[PDB]
Design an enzyme around this catalytic site. Structure first.
Site, PDB file in Angstrom:
ATOM      1  N   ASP A  78       0.821  -1.309  -0.468  1.00 26.63           N
ATOM      2  CA  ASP A  78      -0.463  -0.625   0.055  1.00 26.63           C
ATOM      3  C   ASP A  78       0.691   1.547   0.103  1.00 26.63           C
ATOM      4  O   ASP A  78       1.483   1.898   1.105  1.00 26.63           O
ATOM      5  CB  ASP A  78      -0.570  -0.213   1.352  1.00 26.63           C
ATOM      6  N   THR A  79       0.714   2.370  -1.229  1.00 24.59           N
ATOM      7  CA  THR A  79       1.768   3.525  -1.075  1.00 24.59           C
ATOM      8  C   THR A  79       1.237   4.632  -0.535  1.00 24.59           C
ATOM      9  O   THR A  79       1.367   5.342   0.114  1.00 24.59           O
ATOM     10  CB  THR A  79       2.391   3.244  -2.651  1.00 24.59           C
ATOM     11  N   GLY A  80      -0.521   4.604   0.201  1.00 31.14           N
ATOM     12  CA  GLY A  80      -0.790   5.227   0.258  1.00 31.14           C
ATOM     13  C   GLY A  80      -0.668   5.407   2.017  1.00 31.14           C
ATOM     14  O   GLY A  80      -1.306   6.416   2.707  1.00 31.14           O
TER      15      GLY A  80
HETATM   16  O1  DMP Z   1      -7.927   3.942   5.360  1.00 36.33           O
HETATM   17  C1  DMP Z   1      -7.159   3.702   4.073  1.00 36.33           C
HETATM   18  N1  DMP Z   1      -7.862   2.559   3.448  1.00 36.33           N
HETATM   19  C2  DMP Z   1      -9.046   2.891   2.862  1.00 36.33           C
HETATM   20  C3  DMP Z   1      -9.519   2.994   1.522  1.00 36.33           C
HETATM   21  C4  DMP Z   1     -10.534   2.039   0.890  1.00 36.33           C
HETATM   22  C5  DMP Z   1     -11.225   2.310   0.334  1.00 36.33           C
HETATM   23  C6  DMP Z   1     -10.602   2.720  -0.615  1.00 36.33           C
HETATM   24  C7  DMP Z   1     -11.287   4.020  -2.377  1.00 36.33           C
HETATM   25  O2  DMP Z   1     -12.017   2.549  -3.082  1.00 36.33           O
HETATM   26  C8  DMP Z   1      -9.372   4.184  -0.376  1.00 36.33           C
HETATM   27  C9  DMP Z   1      -9.301   4.207   0.364  1.00 36.33           C
HETATM   28  C10 DMP Z   1      -7.252   1.800   2.243  1.00 36.33           C
HETATM   29  C11 DMP Z   1      -6.727   0.705   3.319  1.00 36.33           C
HETATM   30  C12 DMP Z   1      -7.193   0.147   3.276  1.00 36.33           C
HETATM   31  C13 DMP Z   1      -8.545  -0.378   2.635  1.00 36.33           C
HETATM   32  C14 DMP Z   1      -9.907  -1.316   2.500  1.00 36.33           C
HETATM   33  C15 DMP Z   1     -10.081  -1.782   3.402  1.00 36.33           C
HETATM   34  C16 DMP Z   1      -9.117  -0.577   4.332  1.00 36.33           C
HETATM   35  C17 DMP Z   1      -8.179  -0.444   4.668  1.00 36.33           C
HETATM   36  C18 DMP Z   1      -5.720   2.710   2.039  1.00 36.33           C
HETATM   37  O3  DMP Z   1      -4.932   1.816   0.385  1.00 36.33           O
HETATM   38  C19 DMP Z   1      -4.539   3.357   2.609  1.00 36.33           C
HETATM   39  O4  DMP Z   1      -3.394   3.678   2.315  1.00 36.33           O
HETATM   40  C20 DMP Z   1      -5.102   4.960   3.800  1.00 36.33           C
HETATM   41  C21 DMP Z   1      -5.782   5.851   3.183  1.00 36.33           C
HETATM   42  C22 DMP Z   1      -5.832   6.713   3.414  1.00 36.33           C
HETATM   43  C23 DMP Z   1      -4.467   7.503   3.936  1.00 36.33           C
HETATM   44  C24 DMP Z   1      -4.359   8.319   5.078  1.00 36.33           C
HETATM   45  C25 DMP Z   1      -5.526   9.094   5.550  1.00 36.33           C
HETATM   46  C26 DMP Z   1      -6.669   8.317   5.514  1.00 36.33           C
HETATM   47  C27 DMP Z   1      -6.813   7.218   4.483  1.00 36.33           C
HETATM   48  N2  DMP Z   1      -6.417   3.756   4.260  1.00 36.33           N
HETATM   49  C28 DMP Z   1      -5.520   4.503   5.902  1.00 36.33           C
HETATM   50  C29 DMP Z   1      -5.108   4.208   6.392  1.00 36.33           C
HETATM   51  C30 DMP Z   1      -4.023   5.169   7.393  1.00 36.33           C
HETATM   52  C31 DMP Z   1      -2.289   4.916   7.673  1.00 36.33           C
HETATM   53  C32 DMP Z   1      -2.292   2.890   8.186  1.00 36.33           C
HETATM   54  C33 DMP Z   1      -1.208   3.072   8.647  1.00 36.33           C
HETATM   55  O5  DMP Z   1       0.171   4.136   8.227  1.00 36.33           O
HETATM   56  C34 DMP Z   1      -3.042   2.404   7.191  1.00 36.33           C
HETATM   57  C35 DMP Z   1      -3.739   3.096   6.791  1.00 36.33           C
END
Ligand code: DMP
Lengths: 99, 99
Positions: free
Chosen positions: B25-27
């Site tokens: 996950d790059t995000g």
């Molecule tokens: O909620 C997150 N979704 C949720 C999500 C679901 C659906 C879509 C549209 O289809 C977009 C995003 C992803 C990971 C994930 C996927 C599926 C189910 C549960 C989780 C995402 O891919 C990740 O990048 C970050 C995006 C993000 C980043 C910063 C702020 C808000 C959202 N997140 C949250 C996240 C935050 C911190 C960490 C640890 O550092 C890990 C994850």
């Protein structure tokens, strides 16, 4: 360009006349943008993330220009803290992940 | 490996004797894993995503093997619905994004 991951991979987009930065996100299946002015019809959808679910409006067939590259597709607009470009558009722009 | 993004980019990992599959996950800045048994103790933190926040335990200096590649870093263990490898370990296995 090739992007290392020492820093968050942020890109400039233009959508709907407006200029934003967005996160390139291989973990998101779809694109989701924070709340914005987009004309037209949409549908409510809810999506689940870490932390729980949000309600989002789904817009289809939206043009986005992302870095120099232009794609068309569904964008979900909603209360996200970050603008996320997920794989529905990454595959159009041809992004790949390598190690 | 070069991985296109038409499907979710999952890889097998081995952590603490157990085998799991996780999303590249790059995000995501950090790695966050579903609840499992890990030795040692740990600090509690809260991370926020879509939906909102979760409470996790940080473990540090954890060894993970992700494809054939071993890395040590902090790991957050908590109520995520999906195991996520974020940029803190993606950096160590040398992952890049290219478009
Ligand atoms: O909620 C997150 N979704 C949720 C999500 C679901 C659906 C879509 C549209 O289809 C977009 C995003 C992803 C990971 C994930 C996927 C599926 C189910 C549960 C989780 C995402 O891919 C990740 O990048 C970050 C995006 C993000 C980043 C910063 C702020 C808000 C959202 N997140 C949250 C996240 C935050 C911190 C960490 C640890 O550092 C890990 C994850």
């Amino acid at each position: 360009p090739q992007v290392t991951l020492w820093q968050r991979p942020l890109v400039t987009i233009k959508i709907g006349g407006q200029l934003k930065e967005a996160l390139l996100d291989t973990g998101a299946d779809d694109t989701v943008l924070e709340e914005m002015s987009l004309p037209g019809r949409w549908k409510p959808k809810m999506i689940g993330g870490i932390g729980g679910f949000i309600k989002v409006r789904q817009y289809d067939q939206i043009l986005i220009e992302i870095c120099g590259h232009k794609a068309i597709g569904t964008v979900l607009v909603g209360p996200t803290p970050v603008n996320i470009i997920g794989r529905n558009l990454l595959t159009q722009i041809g992004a790949t992940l390598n190690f």
